Assembly symmetry: C2
Homo-oligomer: 140 residues x 2
């Protein structure tokens, strides 16, 4: 399961947030985009796949994933197309929304907070640690 991601959209302050969750780790990446378009989705996926070993993305079946540009991006990147941390992200965005002028800044603060937050006590791991451990282990 190291190459499995789930992608979802969130709408906030009349803007769109694209969120990718690495399913096995809970690690997230996110971008704020003007609108939920095929071009933006394709670009997002291309960035994701240049950064992590992406094999499969699970999506809602919106039209932004059907587009020919998204299909070309996925073909090129070797990606196959097919809420727990999602309500959380919204939560953290609120907790810090005041520390920032723009929405996209608060979003990236929340991603930061989420990915570095240790789960559990001493002995625990953050999501950022889990994803790299999983991938490093897979590579052996």
């Amino acid at each position: 399961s190291p190459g499995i991601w789930q992608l979802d959209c969130t709408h906030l302050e009349g803007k769109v947030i694209l969120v990718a969750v690495h399913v096995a780790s809970g690690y997230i990446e996110a971008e704020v985009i003007p609108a939920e378009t095929g071009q933006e989705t394709a670009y997002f996926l291309l960035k994701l796949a240049g950064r992590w070993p992406v094999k499969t993305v699970h999506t809602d079946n919106g039209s932004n994933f059907t587009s020919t540009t998204v299909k070309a991006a996925c073909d090129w990147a070797g990606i196959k197309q097919e809420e727990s941390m999602n309500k959380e992200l919204k939560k953290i965005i609120g907790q810090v929304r005041d520390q920032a002028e723009h929405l996209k800044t608060a979003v990236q603060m929340a991603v930061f907070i989420h990915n570095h937050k240790r789960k559990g006590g001493i002995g625990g791991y953050s999501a950022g640690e889990r994803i790299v451990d999983i991938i490093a282990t897979d590579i052996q």
Copy 2:
């Protein structure tokens, strides 16, 4: 060669600005095309980067975008030690790869990400070696 050290540079192509972050120990890169080297764009890039990797230190070219208060405030928030002026065949490398995929993309920003993808997946050191992508996670992993 600490695992937490990144170098940021900029490169210009077709009248556009590419901000590049290089994980020094592994050669792994991240990049974005931005409208101009401003404080807020730079600060936004750094905050995203720090959200995705354990960034302890960033070496910069001391450009005016880094001396801006917006960037210094981002580094402070993210706990990044900003090291300005601390010392490049990487930019030559990225530009070369960008050339090899440029006719597959309608827009430069797309060709840049494709180039980043190719660089990070390229096996270095022969069939027996590893890519920058493999190297960064092997270096950064705390519990294998």
